[PDB]
Design a protein around this ligand. Sequence first.
Ligand SMILES: Cc1cc2nc3c(=O)[nH]c(=O)nc-3n(C[C@H](O)[C@H](O)[C@H](O)COP(=O)(O)OP(=O)(O)OC[C@H]3O[C@@H](n4cnc5c(N)ncnc54)[C@H](O)[C@@H]3O)c2cc1C
Ligand SMILES: Cc1cc2nc3c(=O)[nH]c(=O)nc-3n(C[C@H](O)[C@H](O)[C@H](O)COP(=O)(O)OP(=O)(O)OC[C@H]3O[C@@H](n4cnc5c(N)ncnc54)[C@H](O)[C@@H]3O)c2cc1C
Ligand code: NA
Ligand code: NA
Lengths: 367, 369, 367, 369
Amino acid sequence: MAVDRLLPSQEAAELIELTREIADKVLDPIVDRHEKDETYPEGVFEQLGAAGLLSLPQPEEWGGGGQPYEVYLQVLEEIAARWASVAVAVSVHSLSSHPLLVFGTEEQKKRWLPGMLSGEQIGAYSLSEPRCAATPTDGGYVINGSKSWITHGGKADFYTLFARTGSRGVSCFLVPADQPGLSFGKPEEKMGLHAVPTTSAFYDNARIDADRRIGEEGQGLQIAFSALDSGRLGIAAVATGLAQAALDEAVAYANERTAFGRKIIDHQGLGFLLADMAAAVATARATYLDAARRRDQGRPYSQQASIAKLTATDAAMKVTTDAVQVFGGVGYTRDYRVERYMREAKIMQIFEGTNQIQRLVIARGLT
Amino acid sequence: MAVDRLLPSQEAAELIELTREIADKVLDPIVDRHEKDETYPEGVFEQLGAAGLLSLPQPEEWGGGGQPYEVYLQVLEEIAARWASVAVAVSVHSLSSHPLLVFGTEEQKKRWLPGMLSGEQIGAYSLSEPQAGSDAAALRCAATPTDGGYVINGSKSWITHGGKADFYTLFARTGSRGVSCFLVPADQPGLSFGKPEEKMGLHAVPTTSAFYDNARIDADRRIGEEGQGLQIAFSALDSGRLGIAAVATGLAQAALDEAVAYANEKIIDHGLGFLLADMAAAVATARATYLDAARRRDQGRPYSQQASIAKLTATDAAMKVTTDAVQVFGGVGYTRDYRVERYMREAKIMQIFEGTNQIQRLVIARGLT
Amino acid sequence: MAVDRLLPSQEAAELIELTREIADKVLDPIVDRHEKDETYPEGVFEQLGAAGLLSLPQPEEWGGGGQPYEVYLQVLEEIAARWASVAVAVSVHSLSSHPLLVFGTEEQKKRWLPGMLSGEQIGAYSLSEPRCAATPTDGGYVINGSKSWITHGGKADFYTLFARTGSRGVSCFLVPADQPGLSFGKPEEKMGLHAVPTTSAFYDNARIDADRRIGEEGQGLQIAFSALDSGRLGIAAVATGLAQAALDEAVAYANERTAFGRKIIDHQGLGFLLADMAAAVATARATYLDAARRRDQGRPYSQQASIAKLTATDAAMKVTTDAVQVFGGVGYTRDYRVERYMREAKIMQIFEGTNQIQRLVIARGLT
Amino acid sequence: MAVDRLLPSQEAAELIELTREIADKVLDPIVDRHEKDETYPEGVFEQLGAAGLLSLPQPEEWGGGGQPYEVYLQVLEEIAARWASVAVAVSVHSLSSHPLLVFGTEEQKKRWLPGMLSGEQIGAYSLSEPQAGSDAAALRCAATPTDGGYVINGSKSWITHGGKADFYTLFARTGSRGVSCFLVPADQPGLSFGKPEEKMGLHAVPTTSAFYDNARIDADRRIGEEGQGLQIAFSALDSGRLGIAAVATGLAQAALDEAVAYANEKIIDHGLGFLLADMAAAVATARATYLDAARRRDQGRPYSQQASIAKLTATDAAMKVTTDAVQVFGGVGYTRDYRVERYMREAKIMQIFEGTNQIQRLVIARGLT
Ligand SMILES: Cc1cc2nc3c(=O)[nH]c(=O)nc-3n(C[C@H](O)[C@H](O)[C@H](O)COP(=O)(O)OP(=O)(O)OC[C@H]3O[C@@H](n4cnc5c(N)ncnc54)[C@H](O)[C@@H]3O)c2cc1C
Ligand SMILES: Cc1cc2nc3c(=O)[nH]c(=O)nc-3n(C[C@H](O)[C@H](O)[C@H](O)COP(=O)(O)OP(=O)(O)OC[C@H]3O[C@@H](n4cnc5c(N)ncnc54)[C@H](O)[C@@H]3O)c2cc1C
Ligand code: NA
Ligand code: NA
């Protein structure tokens, strides 16, 4: 009943089985309770970290696994099938370390990367706003202004920040949890995806060392643009895992429940609905792996990653809406998980670039 | 920012005007808090009933307002744009009086009908069981004949207004022509209600199960002949399916108004125009479809196919429009700072009750055979 | 098996039965042959004309029927179910007379309207181009330039023309068939809708009397804008009739053909496809009548007419594509009509304002 | 303006390069005229065969090119972007050699296989009858046993390359396990072909019926055991469904390139951007889906579900992309001055043959049971 996967090696299959074993004993027994109460899973990230699952695609020299995206994306997909909000946070952690790895000095990487990729820390990514500025000073910078929609806000070990210093008018910072002048608003009240908090930040004459600026002064916009494709790939794989979870529920229910003297899967009309869901899940998985396989070969994959995010998140919204339908009246109650999965899928159409903005990007790439 | 309506007279126009006033004064200011807390709205059904709004379509000789469906359904639409859960309950009340009005004895009508349509009472309708929602004929609640009556033993489920209605229209087994209809009072001995279902949305009016424990009932409470029940339940389908078509259209219209206002406060420019255009087409199309079926009914013509088409069309539109309305707001659309996330949760169950959209398609195909 | 219609009177029902009787003996026995050979139905318009069907909505004082749009649109729908290209031409004829009726002088109407609405003439409408100018002269105007996509081009008795004389820089003309300086290109080779020709026009120092200018000099753009809503309503009703014809074929075929030991309509999956088609036909008919009913009461109906054209033409493309599917392999051959109906529906999405341009119009009406 | 392909080696890249050259030189300059006139392309299959293009996937020990499906299918895609009717015929030729290659005797293979894969021959595949397309088991063409052979009496239909192939793979009735397979030569006595079907599109290679009139055949021509036929026909389904997925993707890609060029010559501005964006997503998604199934096959793993999904997905995409490509051109898109009106007519039959898209859905649902 588990997905039959296309994998490059024996060691990759054994990584998949390891993820499935940890997810089923650390994630599955606690997910419904924490999402209902909107409480934080303390200690869950440490256990994922110790099994090597928080630093899979980063180079081994810096303490990562050096796994390709074709393998890493599928592990992410397996996590999301058990707990979507935790999978989103695992993806955010990968992006949070990208500036230092790609643009940091040799001195900066020896100082901080081992710690970031040890499995004991968790990172957050901070660029969105509701005009946040860093002004020069002796030996560094002073920060003033506001930030919005930070995943893991208030709970992370470190924060990646973008702040104004025209074209080359932006700069990137590695900000520590203990930063003087830094505070966080209350967690947002959302329709779903409750466990990992989402918060805004406020900087009040916050002073920072020059040694925490990542890359050259003005290199900000280039740094942030360099991480778009990888983020969209992350969310494509998360949406695919939630679509798979909703499909597994419906398939199981349609093989037990009966009406008019037969199992409901045996009514041809209902069978066709289930068939469209399964085709949409398999098309979304095929599309993200095709982009992944380009990235692993050092080929351009920018158009392909926008297509993958678009395809996968539209698929999840359609499949979860249809899984409630398969259940009937009980599917509309909290005795089952399908109502929660439908609430989680809607926000995937919106973040990491809205789907309208994905269509715009694809268009500009044909003009 | 108010729907331009096609109405048969100046009188109907003022009745719409009366509805907008009551809904904006009584329903709109308390709806967010009651849906969030999951509590019952005391006093609300008493206020609508005194205005005439709970008995519009029924004949005046029995205390109704005599209105045609072309007017009744559009009043229902205006209500549902403020509070979907309340309008669903209004629709159920109409169905709950239907078996007595069409099938009862003149003596039975004289007893009970005037109190039902008075504006102070609330009706509920009870047909579904756990092993039988879509498939009606497989029901099993037992009503077995006694000296001058019946004894009822069994279970029912998914009762809208369960545990709060003044009367219940019941369907129980006496023997294919084995089913009968009953008017059950709220004080019936042996009758009890389980706890309210915990749902994804539509929280205010409760949905509950029922249990009959040696519930002896007078044989004068039976509506129609013994074994007539499935014919009674079948005759109400057309009317109920139009009710819900009107409710889904008003929920879609409410979500469309939120998104138009937001896109103007421009966010429209920064392909949102085309998304809003497709939303506006969906609402207009659903409204015209339910009205076409209504005029056929008002004229005394066949309207069964057209009523299935209206319900399917209007509920598929609410699910699509509410989902795209969250999309128009962006990230704040996904928070409880606005109403659109609630509207999306309310639309899903509409695709499911009053005959699922797969049953609707099966009805339509049969009408082509 | 004929459509059950909502009609205002006894006399309207009897108009419907008259249309059905004429269409079934004048149109149905000859449509497949003329469309296959791409030849013109000489004499068909005279017979429609003599039964009063070419001037149904124009006022009785000028020789029309004074019928409301709620009745006229449904007659048009009945014609289109038998021969779509002839129905489009009937609609074009209504528009061709609109300028003179609404903006013409009392002298101009006594001269020409009775003839136009007698049933012996046929009119065409000429505004599209691939910059056509009328320059002043003693006693009138001289015309130079080109026009495109004229339905009935080369075969009409009269032509409604728009030509340049900024804001108020356009003027409208009633041009006769015998106009010196006027010629027509060869008929366009289209995917379908062959019987009534579509042509371009060329004006070569073409001199015209001032008495043929309709309305004031500069009133052109206002005249042309005043006819948009009515045209869109015409095409909505034509698309609805072609969708109905494709649905009737498929329903008939699905009740005879058998597979796996049962009539194919009895396979629930196929039954659901037929059910979606029927719902789309009924939704399109409901939408155009709702706009019609506004126009009959002197209420605004501009947004509603754009919605109706959009809804109905998208419905026809979906229903005709699905009717071929119901037929299987035989549906892809010219032994049946469903392949022709699919070719006819595509051009309805395009003309009288493309569907993208309809979406734009609806958007501007919410801004 | 050329597809960026993922390929397993430099050798495969050059084979793609060879395909683009032959297709642009031989197919592209004559395609519009032959499809318009409805005539056969003499010399064309002879030229592709000498380049190795008619036997790519089969083993070298028998004269094929040994290519995996991940390469074969993408060559098929490049062809179909120039001439859809020709690429369909290439796909059929592969299926026509399949029963002999997997089920025959070593002695049977030695006789006939090398000539089939030589590049000079053309194969056809014959299964469907008028009373049996979707439902295979209901076939009725009779093959009755004689002294050292069989006698064939009956009718077959919808034969691609009917009346022009060098050999025919036939399925006829001998007795559920009542069906057998036959390799029929083009010079068989008692065999005749009806006139070409008049179709909406795909005109160049003819589709015809066949008639067997006391057609005596040698018992050494039977492929596999007596009563093995339905198992043989079943085993070819997975392969044929991928062939057509590749053909539909290349037809969609051709229609996408036309519309992108036109929108740039701006027409894009005057919501065409969003329509083109959805077209580009549909093509990319169909390509990735057929390739995922191909790599499973190349690895010797189960790929049945994934092959049904690929065919359904890729043909639904061709119908949607070709229909929107006419839309991008406007009025001139509806004329025979451009290719897009032809592409739209070609896409419709793809939803129908090699198992209709309703049968595909039925296969997928069963795999979930
Ligand atoms: C909030 C709420 C309020 C309600 N209020 C009332 C009420 O007041 N009175 C009342 O009588 N009922 C009420 N109901 C019950 C409601 O009408 C049923 O839940 C619904 O109609 C479907 O029945 P089910 O839940 O048993 O689904 P099932 O019948 O178990 O169906 C499950 C799935 O199988 C499919 N299916 C079933 N049969 C077929 C078929 N023949 N062909 C193809 N597919 C099929 C369905 O479409 C569905 O997707 C209420 C329900 C809810 C959720
Ligand atoms: C151009 C062309 C070339 C062809 N070439 C070949 C060839 O080379 N070799 C060959 O063997 N065949 C060939 N065919 C035949 C082709 O495979 C069939 O036409 C097709 O698969 C469908 O069968 P049918 O036409 O009898 O449709 P039918 O089986 O009559 O089906 C009609 C409709 O009913 C539906 N239906 C049928 N069964 C079910 C079911 N169980 N559940 C739900 N719905 C169902 C179908 O989806 C379809 O919509 C060719 C056909 C064409 C058009
Ligand atoms: Na430590
Ligand atoms: Na005359």
